[PDB]
Write a protein that binds this ligand. Structure first.
Ligand SMILES: N[C@H](CCC(=O)N[C@@H](CS)C(=O)NCC(=O)O)C(=O)O
Ligand SMILES: N[C@H](CCC(=O)N[C@@H](CS)C(=O)NCC(=O)O)C(=O)O
Ligand SMILES: N[C@H](CCC(=O)N[C@@H](CS)C(=O)NCC(=O)O)C(=O)O
Lengths: 142, 142, 142
């Protein structure tokens, strides 16, 4: 029940992080409005087009997949090499990946940060679910 | 001895990566100082009442909660499920962290960087202590 | 021979995420021309010798250090305590680093971004072969 609940943590959170890494940036280096009105780069905000929705997206899209990942990686992981439980694990991949993606996607389109409202808490709250499930178990093991 | 040691290392960094983020989320967004001069949402350097502290404050925390984390989790864990030692495990969590938290609320409150200069050194060395205390176990094994 | 592959995983990436995090702060807080023309800080971009390469390089190395870590270690951790193979986990550990070092450094140097387009695919493709090597092997442990 253990090792498998972890398999998909690779597949799914790769997509989540590093395929959203490979899409974003790859889509960016082709669309390059950079070499902007003659520049060395840095400073994001000459035309709206170039950087306005992108500099957020590149940051946000990176932000989202950055923020969730570690809490869902390590908290799980150092609990995961200890003999933990099935169902329990599986629902975190459903609360995290779904908690994040409805978090990530809502915050990319509509520009407004308040939209990051509803899912941002769905990401915060399996960290109340994960962290403790470690604590009582590991303490149970010893 | 091993698994109680890496035990409380989840909880230090659920309060530290994710309690801090949750608050710096929760209080930032309740008094939401956005919907700014009728703006499609980005930016963050007009009103001192709005951003200056917050934009510092919030990215201050994240920037600190991320950086020392990486080489604490990664570095520790390649070396955990391997065969560790106690007073050494148990310093790294307290050395790193109190190497971080008085680095993190320091740079927080008073804006001026000088502040972070000491305690950040008090944390950096731990990545070497871990580095060498990791590598020797890694050398005993071979 | 598992750990054999893994023992310099921990260390070499100290040179990457925290010996680079180190000099870059050690060096910055030191060289620092902060106190910037009368300044309670935040905002790093008046005079070039002070702000432009610094704030960039600081963050140029950083953001690059950040993004190689996760797929590499986290994908490499799950599938690690599991029964892997040296060559394999030697290919993945080597190519990534020598692919990301040319990536980080490139961008780091000539302020421009287009110089990064090259080795980040030579970083992202290991992401793609590591991410499968998890699932495949991780299907053979069940
Ligand atoms: N949205 C892309 C993410 C692609 C990505 O994961 N790139 C990593 C290595 S492949 C990186 O260090 N890129 C930083 C850069 O844009 O130069 C980005 O611009 O960062
Ligand atoms: N204050 C939060 C830090 C806490 C945190 O990790 N929040 C996550 C979990 S919802 C987030 O996706 N924040 C959305 C955002 O600000 O872009 C932040 O600005 O991001
Ligand atoms: N160039 C330095 C790199 C040194 C570093 O890794 N600093 C981290 C870890 S102690 C930090 O907490 N930075 C806060 C700051 O930059 O003031 C930086 O600007 O951060």
């Amino acid at each position: 029940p253990a090792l498998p609940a972890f398999l998909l943590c690779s597949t799914l959170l790769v997509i989540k992080m590093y395929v959203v890494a490979i899409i974003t940036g790859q889509v960016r280096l082709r669309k390059k409005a950079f070499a902007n009105p003659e520049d060395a780069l840095r400073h994001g905000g000459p035309q709206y087009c170039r950087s306005d929705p992108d500099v957020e997206r590149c940051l946000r899209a990176h932000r989202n997949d950055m923020e969730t990942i570690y809490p869902f990686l390590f908290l799980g992981f150092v609990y995961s090499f200890l003999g933990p439980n099935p169902f329990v694990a599986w629902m975190h991949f459903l609360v995290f990946l779904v908690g994040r993606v409805a978090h990530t996607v809502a915050y990319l389109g509509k520009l407004r940060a308040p939209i990051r409202s509803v899912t941002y808490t769905l990401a915060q709250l399996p960290c109340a679910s994960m962290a403790l499930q470690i604590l009582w178990e590991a303490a149970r093991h010893l």
